[PDB]
Every structure is written in C-alpha cells, then in structure tokens.
Design a protein around this ligand. Structure first.
Ligand SMILES: [Zn+2]
Ligand SMILES: [Zn+2]
Length: 114
C-alpha cells in the first residue's frame, strides 16, 4: 500500500524501486528535469535544486547563470561528444539522485506490489 510519498505526483510510492534526495521522496519516472527536459543523472552522489524548484544548475544557468545558449557543455572541438560542446556544462554536482529500493520491494505482481 502506501509507504512513501513522491513529490512529483504525490500519489504515493508503492513501487519496488524509488528515488529520493531533495528532502522528500520521488518516483523513477517522476523525478524529471524542470526546464532542459532531460533526466538529470541518476548516479547517486550530489544533488542540485533551488529553494522551491527541482531545477538543474544548467537550467538555473540558463536564466540566472552565464549561459542561455544552444551549445552546452565545455568549449572543446566538436567531434560528436556528450557534455563538452558549448558553455552550459553538465552535472558532477547536479541532481545525482540515489536510485534506492522500497522497504516493500517484494513486488508480488511483477512491476506492481500489494
Ligand atoms: Zn510520483
Ligand atoms: Zn534541467
């Protein structure tokens, strides 16, 4: 039933896996980005968010940072590589949420629990 509550849909996390870090709990497909429209970086480490926004550093950099361009990343030769392309970098200290498991991870119904 109801174990944790996600801050994205707030419909409770009865899943087997779940994500959390900001200050509350989330969902795997709920914890998305605000403005870039990506999916941060689900490699548990640090996290980047504002007072009341789960907005990226690059998102924050797009309006109140130093970017606001198309070419994102570090200024390096364009060979078709991730991150390093322009100026609005990536993560490292960004929303690297910890992909955790639920206490009732059981999963009595496959990708659905009781
Ligand atoms: Zn949710
Ligand atoms: Zn973003």
């Amino acid at each position: 039933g109801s174990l944790l509550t996600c801050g994205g849909c707030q419909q409770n996390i009865g899943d087997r896996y779940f994500l959390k870090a900001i200050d509350q709990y989330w969902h795997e497909d709920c914890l998305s980005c605000d403005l870039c429209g990506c999916r941060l970086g689900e490699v548990g480490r640090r996290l980047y968010y504002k007072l009341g926004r789960k907005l990226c550093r690059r998102d924050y950099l797009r309006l109140g940072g130093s970017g606001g361009h198309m070419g994102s990343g570090g200024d390096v030769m364009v060979v078709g590589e991730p991150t390093l392309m322009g100026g609005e970098f990536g993560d490292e200290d960004e929303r690297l949420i910890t992909r955790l498991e639920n206490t009732q991870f059981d999963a009595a119904n496959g990708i659905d629990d009781e």
